[PDB]
Amino acid sequence: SRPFLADFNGFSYLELKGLHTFMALEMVFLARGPSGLLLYNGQKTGKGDFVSLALHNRHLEFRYDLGKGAAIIRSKEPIALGTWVRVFLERNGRKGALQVGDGPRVLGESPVPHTMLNLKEPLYVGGAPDFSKLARGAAVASGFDGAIQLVSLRGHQLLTQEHVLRAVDVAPFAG
User: How far from 49 is each of 26, 53, 74, CA to CA, in Å?
Assistant: 20, 14, 19
* Burial of 12 from C-beta contacts in 10 A (0-12 / 13-18 / 19+): buried
**Beta 6-9 vs 145-153: how paired, if at all?**
antiparallel
Which residues on neighbouring strands pair with residue 54, listed in sequence order?
37, 61
Resolution in units of Å: 1.4
DSSP states of the chain? --B--EEEESS-EEEE--GGG--EEEEEEEESSS-EEEEEEES----S-EEEEEEETTEEEEEEESSS-EEEEE-SSPPPTTSEEEEEEEEETTEEEEEETTSPPEEEEPPSS-------SPEEES--S-GGGS-GGG---SB-EEEEEEEEETTEE--BGGGEEEEES-EE---
Angstrom distance (rounded) from CA 124 to CA 148: 13
> Which residue in 97, 94, 92, 134 sits closest to 110, CA to CA?
94
> Which residue in 66, 70, 63, 105 sits closest to 87, CA to CA?
105
CB atoms within 10 A of CB 166: 12
- What residues contact 147, with CB distance under 8 A and at least 6 apart? 5, 6, 7, 8, 29, 30, 173
Sheet holding 164-168: strands in order across? 70-74, 59-65, 50-56, 36-42, 123-125, 13-16, 164-168
Contact 137, 64 (CB under 8 A): no
Method of determination used here: X-ray
Show the domains of the chain with their CATH numbers: 1-175 (2.60.120.200)
- What's the angle, vertex CA 139, arms to CA 98 and CA 6, rounded to 5? 65
For the stretch 112-115, contacts whose Cβ atoms lie closer than 8 Å and that sit 24 or more positions apart, written own/partner, are 112/68, 113/68, 114/66, 114/67, 114/68, 115/66
First to last CA, the chain: 24
